[PDB]
């Protein structure tokens, strides 16, 4: 059905999606000079220490790295978030070229690829129900740029060719997330939307303005994965990014000055 091609991408979502055409749609372009230092933001809690990843699974629209959220583990709190959220699941966005690849921009510039982290807040039970809420969801968003390796994120890499169909799982267990996030946590913040199919406006996205490095290798590792599954046409799951959409009645909170 939906996907990333002429005839079934983020163009053609709205016919079946109608929120596709929403007031609060993601991604969206963060103008830097136009966000404002929020001093009513609290400090950001990313506590991984205790994450407990279980697999990795291709979906046909991009890969999920699943995490074990039966319990109190894996929690971000603080910013502009009330309550805790629990880690569930994170996955990439990515280009065909180094060029593009991330949904959100900054100042209108693409990077190569953007991290998804994503929480539900606990108080609604599960992620069924807090997708059903206009704060049920919170999800970091890490850009990624071409330079230096991640040291963090090559085991990921590595298992990606056992997975390379849609359909495909593969155990993944004892994956670290925190080797995935840059030094700093500064961020900007704004309420949004799932930036696929669905598109339900039930996020509070917070996007870290430090990008992290990936190296080239890396990268085109993630362009060897196929939309497609075993026996049909392949069709490389590059450009897996939906673009920026109309801000709308909404304003960007950055929390540093
Ligand atoms: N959300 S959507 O992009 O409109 N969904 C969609 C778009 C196109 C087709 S198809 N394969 O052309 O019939 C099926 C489903
Ligand atoms: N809830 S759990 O079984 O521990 N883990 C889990 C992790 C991810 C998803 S999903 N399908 O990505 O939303 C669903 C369940
Ligand atoms: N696929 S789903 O079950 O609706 N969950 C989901 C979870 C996160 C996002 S995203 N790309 O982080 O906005 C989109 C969809
Ligand atoms: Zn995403």
């Given at each position: 059905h939906w996907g990333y091609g002429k005839h079934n991408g983020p163009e053609h979502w709205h016919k079946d999606?109608?929120?596709?055409?929403?007031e609060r749609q993601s991604p969206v372009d963060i103008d830097t000079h136009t966000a404002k230092y929020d001093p009513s933001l609290k400090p950001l809690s990313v506590s991984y220490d205790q994450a407990t990843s279980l697999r990795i699974l291709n979906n046909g629209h991009a890969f999920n790295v699943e995490?074990?959220?039966?319990?109190?583990?894996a929690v971000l709190k603080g910013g502009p978030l009330d309550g805790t959220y629990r880690l569930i699941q994170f996955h990439f966005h990515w280009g065909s070229l180094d060029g593009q690849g991330s949904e959100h921009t900054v100042d209108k510039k693409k990077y190569a690829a953007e991290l998804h982290l994503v929480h539900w807040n606990t108080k609604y039970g599960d992620f069924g129900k807090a997708?059903?809420?206009?704060?049920?969801l919170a999800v970091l968003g890490i850009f990624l740029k071409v330079g230096?390796?991640?040291?963090?994120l090559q085991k990921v890499v590595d298992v990606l060719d056992s997975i390379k169909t849609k359909g495909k799982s593969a155990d993944f267990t004892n994956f670290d997330p925190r080797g995935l996030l840059p030094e700093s946590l500064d961020y900007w913040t704004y309420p949004g939307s799932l930036?696929?199919?669905?598109?339900?406006?039930c996020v509070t996205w917070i996007v870290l303005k430090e990008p992290i490095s990936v190296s080239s290798e890396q990268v085109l590792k993630f362009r060897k994965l196929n939309f497609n599954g075993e026996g049909e046409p392949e069709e490389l799951m590059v450009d897996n990014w939906r673009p920026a959409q109309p801000l709308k009645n909404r304003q960007i909170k950055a929390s540093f000055k």
């Open positions: 999606f109608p929120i596709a055409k929403g995490f074990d959220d039966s319990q109190d583990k997708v059903q809420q206009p704060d049920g230096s390796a991640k040291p963090g930036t696929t199919p669905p598109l339900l406006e």
